[PDB]
Amino acid sequence: TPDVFISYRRNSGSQLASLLKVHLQLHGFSVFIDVEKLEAGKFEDKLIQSVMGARNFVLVLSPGALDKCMQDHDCKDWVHKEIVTALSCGKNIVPIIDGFEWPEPQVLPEDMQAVLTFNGIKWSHEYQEATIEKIIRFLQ
Amino acid sequence: TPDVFISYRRNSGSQLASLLKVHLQLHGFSVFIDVEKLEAGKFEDKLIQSVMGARNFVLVLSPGALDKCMQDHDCKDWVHKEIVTALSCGKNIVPIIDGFEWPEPQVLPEDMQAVLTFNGIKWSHEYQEATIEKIIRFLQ
């Protein structure tokens, strides 16, 4: 059981997600990110179960990262599925803000609007060590 | 005198440049990147001095990273300035390709066209440890 699950958008947050993984691992956290820990089998069940296993849900909110979730009421988008799983399970959700614009709740499907109520951490390129140290304070 | 200077475009390569910085330090290299090592003074002189001082010049080629170099014949663009300094000083240039597309050399100012003749490393999101090991192989 990894302690932290990192959810991110491939096209805009892959580098920040990877950087969070390295830092969190250096500070002793077991981290789940797909490219390191998603292995053999049907990936839908493996991903969802890996969200369920992690106490902490770190959400990389790069620019436009929730765009594909909009109008995704069938829950086909994978960031959407991961967020809903995290919310449903009562995870400690820690959004990471990297140029993300806060949207109106009503543009997001009802089952994920609650993600916007969690206190988010601004990623600071100029003060990255301080950002990392704050993220660690948020983890459990 | 850091062993490695990391040159990058803020608007598209900040995260990968920081990720490279962390990994290279973890493997024992002294690294210069502006957000960690550029301190007080006239920044033009300090940056140029820092490029001249570093044996290895790691160039983060994010998508469109050399675009603002194009037709910058007064050498006002800062990536352009760092590249010309590295070329002029005969540094070990190691381009890192992250979705960057190789241009026709003549689109670049004549004083930096040679950057394309250096063997570049592909950044692989799925094989990051292998990418980092290759980068370290390339460094002196």
Ligand SMILES: CN(C(=O)N[C@@H]1COCC1(F)F)[C@H]1CCCOc2c[n+]([C@@H]3O[C@H](COP(=O)(O)OP(=O)(O)OC[C@H]4O[C@@H](n5cnc6c(N)ncnc65)[C@H](O)[C@@H]4O)[C@@H](O)[C@H]3O)ccc21
């Ligand atoms: C198992 N996967 C993998 O990628 N497996 C990779 C190999 O082993 C580990 C690995 F994850 F890196 C894919 C499976 C397809 C669903 O997408 C995800 C999503 N996520 C989680 O969602 C967030 C990212 O969502 P996202 O930015 O919207 O992604 P896209 O931009 O649509 O990328 C998806 C890319 O998968 C390609 N592809 C389609 N079929 C398969 C398949 N059978 N098998 C492999 N790829 C497939 C497709 O063509 C596209 O290019 C994150 O939070 C993340 O946890 C993890 C893994 C996958």
Ligand SMILES: CN(C(=O)N[C@@H]1COCC1(F)F)[C@H]1CCCOc2c[n+]([C@@H]3O[C@H](COP(=O)(O)OP(=O)(O)OC[C@H]4O[C@@H](n5cnc6c(N)ncnc65)[C@H](O)[C@@H]4O)[C@@H](O)[C@H]3O)ccc21
């Ligand atoms: C000292 N600097 C800093 O940034 N200093 C920062 C504070 O201490 C360390 C620090 F570097 F983070 C700036 C100075 C301005 C020139 O640009 C660079 C470039 N680089 C090297 O070039 C590559 C990045 O080139 P690039 O993606 O095109 O850049 P942009 O970000 O598009 O533009 C620059 C941004 O600097 C803002 N800004 C303008 N005035 C100043 C000033 N006095 N003082 C601070 N900022 C200024 C401006 O408004 C804009 O936003 C890389 O390879 C890099 O080595 C390093 C530092 C600076």
